[PDB]
């Protein structure tokens, strides 16, 4: 087509979605991790994660307001990944890299799994 | 902080939100324009428009599944702007610029109003 494009549009949209999350506006699901609860927007979770995409496209699960993750999932790893989903920023540290990679593998967040693999390979 | 950032994350999120819109997945509102109906996600509309932000933060309107726009709003202008919201791409043409600018002013989409004003000023 002959469209023009606003370079900062996608980033501004994500920033606003994160402001709605902060203020708990229109959040429609609670993700339960080892008795730690995280409120979020189903559409943002689906846009970022192959696991949430599969869950909320399921005719029965699409209607659930609570999703319980596998008990092996670490709440801090989930929190870091939820922050990444809403900001593009990943708080990756020596002390959390293993939990973050394991959580990204479970959530099916391929780009996160890739950078964790590379950061781990550099330390060996 | 000491975060790393994935450059294409925001764009990939918006692309996935647009794929959900195309497939009518988790859309939670119908916007009615001069008897033309557009299905969308409330959160994306709020992230892009000052008008939708005010509407869906209202305690009564946040619960509506149908929103009727002012009858002076042109459906094509709305369609072009809805596409922009989900893609960052604006189909701005000599034949639609006046309707697009009038719709962007009503929807409170300041960056769109700005480029329309500049494109109109260049033609005078």
């Amino acid at each position: 087509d002959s469209c023009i494009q606003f370079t900062r549009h996608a980033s501004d949209v994500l920033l606003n979605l994160n402001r709605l999350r902060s203020r708990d506006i229109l959040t429609d699901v609670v993700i339960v991790v080892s008795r730690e609860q995280f409120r979020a927007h189903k559409t943002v979770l689906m846009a970022c994660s192959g696991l949430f995409y599969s869950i909320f496209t399921d005719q029965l699960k699409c209607n659930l307001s609570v999703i319980n993750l596998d008990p092996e999932i670490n709440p801090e790893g989930f929190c870091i990944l939820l922050d990444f989903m809403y900001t593009s920023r990943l708080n990756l540290r020596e002390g959390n890299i293993m939990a973050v990679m394991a959580t990204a593998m479970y959530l099916q967040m391929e780009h996160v799994v890739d950078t964790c693999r590379k950061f781990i390979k550099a330390s060996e | 902080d000491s975060c790393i950032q994935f450059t294409r994350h925001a764009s990939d999120v918006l692309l996935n939100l647009n794929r959900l819109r195309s497939r009518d997945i988790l859309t939670d509102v119908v916007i009615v324009v001069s008897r033309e109906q557009f299905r969308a996600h409330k959160t994306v509309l709020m992230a892009c428009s000052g008008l939708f932000y005010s509407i869906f933060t209202d305690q009564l309107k946040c619960n509506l599944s149908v929103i009727n726009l002012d009858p002076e709003i042109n459906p094509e202008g709305f369609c072009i702007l809805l596409d922009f919201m989900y893609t960052s791409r604006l189909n701005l043409r000599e034949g639609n610029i006046m309707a697009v600018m009038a719709t962007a002013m009503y929807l409170q989409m300041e960056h769109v109003v700005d480029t329309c004003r500049k494109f109109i000023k260049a033609s005078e």
Partner: peptide, 4 residues
């Protein structure tokens, strides 16, 4: 704004 840019030409994409």
């Amino acid at each position: 704004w840019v030409i994409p």
